Every structure is written in structure tokens, then in C-alpha cells.
Amino acid sequence: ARKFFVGGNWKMNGSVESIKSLVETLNNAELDPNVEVVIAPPAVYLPLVREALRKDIQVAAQNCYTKASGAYTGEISAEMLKDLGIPWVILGHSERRHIFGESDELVAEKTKYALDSGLSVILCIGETLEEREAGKTMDVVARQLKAIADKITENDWSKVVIAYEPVWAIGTGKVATPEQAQEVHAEIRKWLAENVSAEVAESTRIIYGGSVNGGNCKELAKQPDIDGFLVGGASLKPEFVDIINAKQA
Amino acid sequence: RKFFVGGNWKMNGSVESIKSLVETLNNAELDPNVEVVIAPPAVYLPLVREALRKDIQVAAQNCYTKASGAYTGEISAEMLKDLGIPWVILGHSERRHIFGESDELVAEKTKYALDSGLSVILCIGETLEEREAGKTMDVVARQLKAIADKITENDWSKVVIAYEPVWAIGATPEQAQEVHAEIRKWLAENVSAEVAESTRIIYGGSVNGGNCKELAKQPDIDGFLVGGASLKPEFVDIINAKQ
Ligand SMILES: [F-]
Numbered sequence: 001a002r003k004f005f006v007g008g009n010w011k012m013n014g015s016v017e018s019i020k021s022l023v024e025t026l027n028n029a030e031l032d033p034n035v036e037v038v039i040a041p042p043a044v045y046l047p048l049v050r051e052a053l054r055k056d057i058q059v060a061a062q063n064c065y066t067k068a069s070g071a072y073t074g075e076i077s078a079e080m081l082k083d084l085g086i087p088w089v090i091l092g093h094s095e096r097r098h099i100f101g102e103s104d105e106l107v108a109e110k111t112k113y114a115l116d117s118g119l120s121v122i123l124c125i126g127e128t129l130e131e132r133e134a135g136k137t138m139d140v141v142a143r144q145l146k147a148i149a150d151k152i153t154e155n156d157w158s159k160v161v162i163a164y165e166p167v168w169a170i171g172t173g174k175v176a177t178p179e180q181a182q183e184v185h186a187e188i189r190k191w192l193a194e195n196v197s198a199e200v201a202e203s204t205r206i207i208y209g210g211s212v213n214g215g216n217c218k219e220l221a222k223q224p225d226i227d228g229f230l231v232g233g234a235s236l237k238p239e240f241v242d243i244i245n246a247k248q249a
Numbered sequence: 250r251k252f253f254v255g256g257n258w259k260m261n262g263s264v265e266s267i268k269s270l271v272e273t274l275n276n277a278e279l280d281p282n283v284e285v286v287i288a289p290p291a292v293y294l295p296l297v298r299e300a301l302r303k304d305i306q307v308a309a310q311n312c313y314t315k316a317s318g319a320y321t322g323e324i325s326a327e328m329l330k331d332l333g334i335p336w337v338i339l340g341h342s343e344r345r346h347i348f349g350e351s352d353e354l355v356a357e358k359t360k361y362a363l364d365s366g367l368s369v370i371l372c373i374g375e376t377l378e379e380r381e382a383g384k385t386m387d388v389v390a391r392q393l394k395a396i397a398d399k400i401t402e403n404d405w406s407k408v409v410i411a412y413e414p415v416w417a418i419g420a421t422p423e424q425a426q427e428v429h430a431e432i433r434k435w436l437a438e439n440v441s442a443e444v445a446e447s448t449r450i451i452y453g454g455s456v457n458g459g460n461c462k463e464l465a466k467q468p469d470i471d472g473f474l475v476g477g478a479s480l481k482p483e484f485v486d487i488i489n490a491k492q
Contacts, residue, residue: 012313012320015331043291044309044328061292063322065260071476072260073341074311074348076290083263084292093321100322101349232319 004221005161005205005228006244007038007122008235009062009090014045022236023052029241031056032248035228038088038122039235043076046086060088060122063096066109068117078117089114090230092124092144094165104147112151115159122230123148124209125188126165129172138187142195145188149196157200162188163209163230176210178220185225214239221246252280252465253409253449253472254488255370256287256479257310257338267293270480271300277485279304280492283472286336286370287479291324294334308336308370311344314357316365326365337362338474340372340392342413356395363404370474371396372453373432374413381416385428390435397440405436405444411453411474418454422463422470425452429469458483461490 014022019041031037040060041049050059065075081089091114092107111121127140141164152160164184169176185206193201208220209230220226231243262270267289279285288308289297298307313323329337339362340355355371362369375388389412396408412428414420429450437445452464453474464470475487 009321011318012315012323012325013317014328042324042328043322044294044324044332044334046292047295067260069261070259071343072347073257073338073343074291075260076292077260080262080290080292086292090321095319095321099320 002203002205002227003036004032004034004247005036005038005207006246007040007060007090007161007163007207007228007230008240009040009093009230009232010042010235011062011095011232012042013236014042016045016048018236019045019048020052023049025238025241026057027052027054029244031241032245035244035247037244040088040090040122046081047084050085058088059086060090061086062090062093064089064091064110064114066106066113068113078114078119081114082118086119088120088122090122090124090163094124094126094167094170097124098167104144107144108147108151111148111160112156115152115156120159120161122161122163122207124163124165124230126167126209129168129174132168137184138191141184141188142191145191146195154197154200157192157196157204161205161207161228163207164188165209165230169210178216178223178226181208181210181220182223182225185223189225212243214242217243217246250447250449250471251284252282252491253284253286253451254490255308255338255409255411255451255472255474256285256484257341257474257476258287258289258479259310259343259476260290261480262290262293264293264296266480267297268300271297273482274305274485275300275302277488279485280489282491283488285488288336288338288370294329294332298333306336307334308338309334310338310341312337312339312358312362312367314354314361326362326367329362329367330365335366336368336370338370338372338411342372342374342415342418345372346376346415352392352395355392356399359396359408360399360404363400363407368407368409370409370411370451372411372413372474374415374453377416377419379416386431389428389432393432393435394439402441402444405440405448409449409451409472411451413453413474420454422460422467425454425464426467426469429467433469456487458486461487465490
């Protein structure tokens with residue numbers, strides 16, 4: 001059975017004081033023991049969070065670059081994350097693909113290097129509104145996944161979690177139903193079965209990275225191919241605890 | 250103008266290597282007349298700020314445009330303020346040319362960092378292709394004009410301009426002095442004579458122990474933005490160039 005996986009992406013949010021309050025709430029919370037939980041603070045707070053946070057929750061960077069070291073002002077490497085005991089990195093987030101123009105190949109290079117440097121990867125994919133209305137949801141996610149598949153080995157996939165972002169329902173005012181999210185997750189899993197292997201399709205957690213809150217997380221978690229969440233704003237809030245507990249009665 | 254030496258570590262550092270670099274700096278004898286700033290990777294900013302001698306200030310290598318928001322992978326100037334990091338490098342050639350930061354984006358970051366109380370090492374400079382097309386003066390003018398349109402005359406007192414001869418990346422002192430003079434003339438004709446007289450213009454080409462004193466001697470070179478040598482004990486020799 002695929003272990004349920006709940007990631008919290010703080011994005012560009014946090015102070016020493018607000019992070020201390022957020023971490024205290026998580027440290028005091030009663031958490032579903034079969035859920036794998038990962039928190040992604042801004043890079044400058046990664047040591048602070050890793051030192052204060054309960055050890056059953058792991059820490060993620062929100063991005064890294066493609067080499068171990070070099071002349072790349074403003075970039076961090078997977079070796080640095082490993083050095084600091086940061087076992088996870090988010091790569092290919094739609095904000096980085098769109099705002100910062102990260103190419104499919106760049107996301108694939110970053111993924112391969114992070115895997116080879118010992119990290120696990122939350123790999124983000126998803127189609128825009130124009131792509132969805134033009135009928136290209138599956139062409140887009142197949143293309144975004146093929147770029148990684150072409151660079152990483154079959155065994156490399158064991159340390160990958162795929163986050164589906166319905167970019168078409170982020171900032172557009174549209175709302176994705178659990179039914180619509182389930183349909184894409186099932187299409188992602190079949191892409192894995194037919195283009196990577198039976199094992200990778202059965203083992204890879206595909207988590208939903210659309211709008212997730214206390215009000216909708218239980219209905220979303222019940223969908224057969226939704227293995228958890230990549231949560232945005234709600235990961236800054238106490239209801240993140242409820243989202244972690246989405247599979248509990 | 251007070252001599253200014255910046256050390257840009259770029260994507261380099263580990264806990265153990267930074268511990269040796271910082272202890273070397275803490276043991277060094279530094280020219281008291283020199284303002285020294287060092288810029289580690291973002292994940293090491295707390296570690297460095299805690300361990301480093303307080304007379305060397307710490308800089309981030311980049312930041313974004315707003316206090317907070319939905320910008321996965323980005324750091325805010327408010328976070329730097331929160332962590333006691335008083336400086337930031339903006340517009341480094343690697344950010345402009347590899348990661349595609351536009352002159353307008355660098356300006357937005359500069360105005361936001363200054364409004365947030367930080368000082369800014371503002372990097373400018375032209376590529377080989379630009380210099381071959383005779384665009385040296387045009388490029389530094391457009392890069393500077395983007396910032397000058399957005400910030401006030403007084404905002405310039407917390408800006409240090411770093412000129413990078415990107416064209417030489419892959420480099421004589423006379424060639425450096427020539428551009429520094431043009432940059433200062435641009436400030437005088439587009440900002441004020443006082444900003445021009447007051448603003449440090451530091452040289453951000455390949456700096457090491459051999460060229461420090463010759464470059465420091467040039468009338469319009471006010472210090473250095475040091476790359477690879479900033480990881481080495483020789484960084485101390487560079488800080489003491491006017492001695
Ligand atoms: F530099």
C-alpha cells in the first residue's frame with residue numbers, strides 16, 4: 001500500500017517568530033502515524049526548522065540547482081542540503097516553471113542531480129488553463145514526466161513523489177473537483193505503468209497539489225489514486241494538522 | 250570614499266569548509282579602514298552570521314521583490330532583515346545571464362531591498378558580444394537607469410556598484426578604470442554630482458593577491474567584489490590592498 005504523503009510548501013513566507021509558533025503547533029499535535037510528512041520552509045530558515053521540529057517530520061528545500069558547487073550566485077546545491085541534513089527537495093513547482101522560466105530539461109537535470117546526491121524529490125507537474133481547454137492535459141503531463149524519465153533510472157523513481165498541480169485551477173478562479181483530480185492522477189499512474197514499469201506505477205505516490213484545506217482534504221484523500229497532498233497556504237495554518245489527518249475518521 | 254571589499258562565495262560551502270574559512274577570517278589582521286562584506290549561500294547565512302567576527306557584515310547572494318507570497322524557492326528582504334543580514338547582492342551577472350533576470354527585475358529588487366533597510370551591492374556590466382558591438386557605455390547606462398528611475402537620490406547612499414567585465418569572463422586595470430570613470434560620469438549626469446562623488450564603484454572581475462594594489466590605485470576603483478579568491482585565505486590579502 002502506498003504510504004500517504006503530506007507536504008507543506010511554505011513558499012516565500014516565514015519569520016523566526018511565526019516559524020516558532022508554527023513549529024510549536026506541529027510539535028504538540030497528534031499526527032496520523034502512517035502519514036509521511038514533509039515541510040518546506042524558505043532556504044534561510046532550513047537549519048532553524050530542522051533543529052526545532054519533531055524528528056518524524058522531515059524538511060525539504062523549495063528548490064536547488066544542477067551541480068555540487070560552482071559559479072552560480074544565488075543558487076544552492078543538493079550537496080549543501082545533504083550537508084545540512086535536508087533529505088527532500090521540491091523541483092519543478094509551477095511557480096518556478098512559469099515565473100522563473102524553468103524548462104522541462106532543467107527540472108529533469110535538477111531531479112537527476114538531487115537523486116544522485118542522495119535526496120528524495122517532490123517532482124511537480126501540471127497543465128495551465130489554456131492547455132486544459134485545448135485538450136492537452138495528458139500531452140503536457142506526459143511531456144513533463146518523459147523529460148525526467150529520460151534522465152533517471154528505474155530505481156531512481158523509488159525516491160520520487162509526483163505532485164500534480166492543476167495550474168488551470170490556480171489563480172483562474174476555477175475550482176477542481178475531486179473527480180477531476182482523480183482522473184488526472186489515474187492518467188499519471190497509467191503513464192508510469194506504460195512508460196517506466198509496473199513497479200514504479202504501483203509504488204510512486206502521486207499527491208494532489210491543487211487547493212487543499214481542512215474543508216476538502218477528506219474527500220480528496222478518499223480518491224483511489226490521490227496519495228496525499230502538496231499544500232500551499234494552509235500549510236502555514238493550524239489546519240495543516242487536519243490535512244495530515246485526512247485519512248482519519 | 251571608504252574602501253569596500255565584498256566576498257561572493259557563489260554556490261560554494263559546507264559546514265566544515267565554512268568553519269575553517271570563518272576561523273581564518275576571525276584570526277586575521279584586517280585593515281581598519283576597509284568595509285568588508287561576505288556573501289555565503291542562503292542556507293548557511295545563520296551559521297555564518299553567528300560565527301563570523303561582527304566587523305565583517307554578511308550578505309545574501311539574491312532576494313526577491315516582495316515581503317512574502319507564492320514564490321516557491323525565493324527569499325524576501327524581510328527575511329534577511331529578520332535574520333540580521335544587512336546586505337544583499339543583486340543583479341550579479343550569473344543571475345542576469347543564466348537565470349534571465351531583466352534590468353527591470355533587478356531594479357524592483359533593489360528598490361524593495363533598500364525600502365526594507367538593506368544595503369545593496371548592485372552588479373552591472375556588459376558581455377563579450379555587447380563589447381564587440383560597441384555597447385559598453387549603452388549597457389551600463391541602461392542597467393543603471395532602471396535603478397535610478399526607481400530609487401531616490403538618498404537611496405543611493407546604501408548602494409555599492411560592482412562592475413563586472415563579463416566580456417573578460419572566459420582584463421587590465423586601465424580597462425577597468427575606463428569603465429569605472431564612465432559609470433561615475435553617468436551618476437553625475439543622471440543622479441547628482443554628490444551621488445557620483447559618494448558612491449563606491451568596486452571592481453568585480455577576476456581579483457586575487459596579485460592585482461589588488463594595482464587596481465586599488467586607480468582613482469575611480471573603490472574596492473572589489475571577489476569571486477573564487479574569497480574562499481581562500483588570500484581574501485585577507487585582498488582586504489588590505491590600500492596597505
Ligand atoms: F563575484
